[PDB]
């Protein structure tokens, strides 16, 4: 009945949209970004691992089944 | 300390009594029988017993009562034993309690 047709790669404009907005969510999971922007959870994990590489997000708990990252502590 | 998912279960009594009682000791715990969680919930109770036995045995008993009472006032499972053990499957059925499946039709 319902299906998820998610995009494999970000466009450049979407890259600007990520650089702007994604660090503003308090929950940053690859699944969170996947549901909002209709993108795959695995590349989502790689994207959040990328905000880690560029140095944009702090990890709360990553684990083989389920990972969780966030924008670093707000205060 | 693997499993690391069951560590706070291990510190609950340690947090309950505090570091001052356990500070004088260093304790290795040998474990056997049961399974991994059963053994974990075992060594939980074990070291708390060994320390109560340490103050009750080699020094004055007021330390044993104060430790033991703080334990009683927090939680009774620490003293009342879990007698619970895994029940065996029985012949006459596909599962544990069922006796064989009566099958109409």
């Amino acid at each position: 009945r319902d299906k998820l047709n998610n995009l494999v790669l970000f466009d450049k404009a979407t890259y600007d949209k990520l650089c702007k907005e994604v660090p503003n969510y308090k929950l940053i999971t690859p699944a969170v970004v996947s549901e909002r922007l209709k993108i795959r959870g695995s590349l989502a994990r790689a994207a959040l691992q990328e905000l880690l590489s560029k140095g944009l997000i702090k990890l709360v708990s990553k684990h083989r089944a389920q990972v969780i990252y966030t924008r670093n502590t707000k205060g | 300390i693997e499993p690391r998912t069951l560590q706070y279960k291990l510190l609950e009594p340690v947090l309950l009594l505090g570091k001052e009682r356990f500070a004088g000791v260093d304790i290795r715990v040998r474990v056997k029988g049961g399974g991994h969680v059963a053994q974990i919930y075992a060594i939980r109770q074990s070291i708390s017993k060994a320390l109560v036995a340490y103050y009750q045995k080699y020094v004055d008993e007021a330390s044993k009562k104060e430790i033991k009472d703080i334990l009683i006032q927090y939680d009774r499972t620490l003293l009342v034993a879990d007698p619970r053990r895994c029940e065996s499957k029985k012949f006459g059925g596909p599962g544990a309690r069922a006796r064989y499946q009566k099958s109409y039709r």
Binding site: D2, L4, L27, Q66 | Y8, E12, Y74, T77, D82
Partner: protein
Amino acid sequence: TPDIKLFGKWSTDDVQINDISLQDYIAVKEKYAKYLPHSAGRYAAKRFRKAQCPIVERLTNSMMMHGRNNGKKLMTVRIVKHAFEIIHLLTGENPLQVLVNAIINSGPREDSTRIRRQAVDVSPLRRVNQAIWLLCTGAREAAFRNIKTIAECLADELINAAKGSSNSYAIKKKDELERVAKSNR
């Protein structure tokens, strides 16, 4: 943290139970809290041993369903652990206050029975048990076949339940039962 406790990063005092109705019988305070829901067990042995069971454990108890997850308490505990942290993160309230709002709204104050059935307001053990089971079935249904994790969906579910949005299956059951009861009570 042996002498004075900061439970991880949580205050003992200053957590107000808002609803006067369930205040004694939600025996949730100063002692019943523990570091995990998970505990040796024996909590369903005697009648009120269930009562003395911690309410976080009762959330764990309800969460594990649909076969493959029966008797995987640490995993469904970890679910409750990361979801509660998340509830605290997103709404900004003490997770048990949001949850008490869940107990308050989702607990059905009455039910119907054969005395043609008539409605009667229920006892606290079943009424809390019922609230926990209901919002668990809601979180599962919402999170099933979605990338979003069960624990994060479970945090979102306790938030929307305390809010009372009428989007929870638990509220759908409550509203159906109440209005049918008014027609035939």
